[PDB]
Design a protein around this ligand. Structure first.
Ligand SMILES: O=C(O)[C@H]1O[C@@H](O)[C@@H](O)[C@@H](O)[C@@H]1O
Length: 333
């Protein structure tokens, strides 16, 4: 059977009551060898290097602008239905597609991370255009084909980028990569990509220990809780997408996805168990950011959320997360 997204992705284009179309960021065709924002850290890779981060953000500026700008345009279109926003979004994505952006075989860890992040953002947003009951892509077949072929090329490459690794090298980056590949799989109806994403979820589920911790995220010391929370959105999205395609992953490794989510939310309330496990007081900075809990939307579509969990979701809605394609609450409501 053809691959499908969760039913919320079939929502009609809205008509809520007008921005213009900015120039497309220059397609990034360069090598993907970038500076790490943690350059100079020890094995925990948790010491921010402000100078390196500045260099990193500068190196990836056109990619960042593309990610944020294109998802914003799709969000605007799905909200208000102005054809100009659709036209602009498709112009941006098809320009990058035709150029073959982000396809470099020259990359380091940071660079391949950028490839999968951008793929997830753009395909995640495009998903709404593709499956909307309004069929907005009907009048844009040539551009649609160009964009989808590009996603397929990138998706195949992302599988290459994160395959062949042992568990100690499989962390939140692989989970995010698997989301990008799942998203691409459904846009492109590619079962092989779907299957890879499912396999990666299963690896993650089996990495969740008996208490709900992930060893490789615990290694990030004072950022441990933050990185556990960072693992949740791609894993929950993969499971929600897999479920409607006939693959139920909710019980993998004794309901590992639930065990991880509950451990995280326990730690958000009381930092104790994470400090005890890491031996360092946790940086709570990221845990204060509402949109970093966007995983609650697919999570509560999968599981019967207890009142604490439901309350956590309601108090932070609506969720916007460009790495998940934009309006997460809308596509699960
Ligand atoms: O420092 C690393 O290992 C990675 O850390 C992650 O948080 C990301 O910042 C990624 O871009 C880096 O390459």
């Amino acid at each position: 059977a053809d691959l499908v997204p969760p039913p919320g992705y079939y929502a009609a284009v809205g008509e809520r009551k007008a921005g213009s179309c900015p120039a497309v960021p220059p397609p990034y065709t360069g090598s993907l060898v970038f500076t790490s924002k943690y350059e100079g850290s020890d094995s925990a890779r948790a010491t921010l290097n402000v100078k390196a981060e500045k260099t990193f953000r500068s190196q990836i500026k056109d990619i960042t602008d593309m990610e944020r700008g294109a998802t914003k345009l799709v969000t605007q279109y799905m909200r208000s239905g102005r054809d100009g926003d659709l036209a602009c979004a498709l112009n941006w994505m098809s320009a990058w597609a035709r150029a073959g952006a982000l396809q470099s075989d020259d990359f380091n860890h940071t660079g391949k991370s950028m490839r999968k992040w951008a793929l997830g953002s753009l395909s995640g947003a495009y998903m709404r255009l593709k499956f909307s009951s309004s069929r907005p892509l009907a009048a844009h077949a040539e551009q649609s084909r160009e964009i989808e072929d590009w996603f397929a090329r990138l998706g195949t490459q992302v599988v290459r980028d994160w395959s062949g690794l042992p568990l100690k090298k499989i962390n939140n980056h692989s989970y995010w990569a698997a989301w990008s590949v799942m998203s691409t799989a459904v846009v492109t109806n590619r079962r092989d990509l779907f299957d890879w994403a499912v396999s990666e979820f299963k690896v993650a589920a089996n990495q969740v220990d008996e208490q709900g911790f992930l060893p490789n995220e615990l290694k990030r010391r004072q950022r441990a809780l933050a990185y556990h929370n960072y693992a949740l959105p791609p894993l929950a999205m993969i499971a929600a997408f897999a479920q409607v395609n006939g693959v139920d992953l909710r019980q993998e490794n004794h309901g590992a996805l639930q065990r991880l989510a509950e451990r995280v939310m326990k730690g958000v309330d009381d930092e104790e168990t994470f400090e005890e496990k890491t031996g360092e007081d946790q940086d709570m900075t990221d845990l204060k950011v509402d949109n970093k809990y966007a995983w609650l939307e697919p999570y509560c579509a999968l599981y019967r959320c207890e009142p604490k969990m439901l309350e956590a979701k309601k108090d932070r809605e609506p969720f916007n997360s460009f790495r998940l394609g934009g309006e997460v609450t809308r596509v699960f409501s």
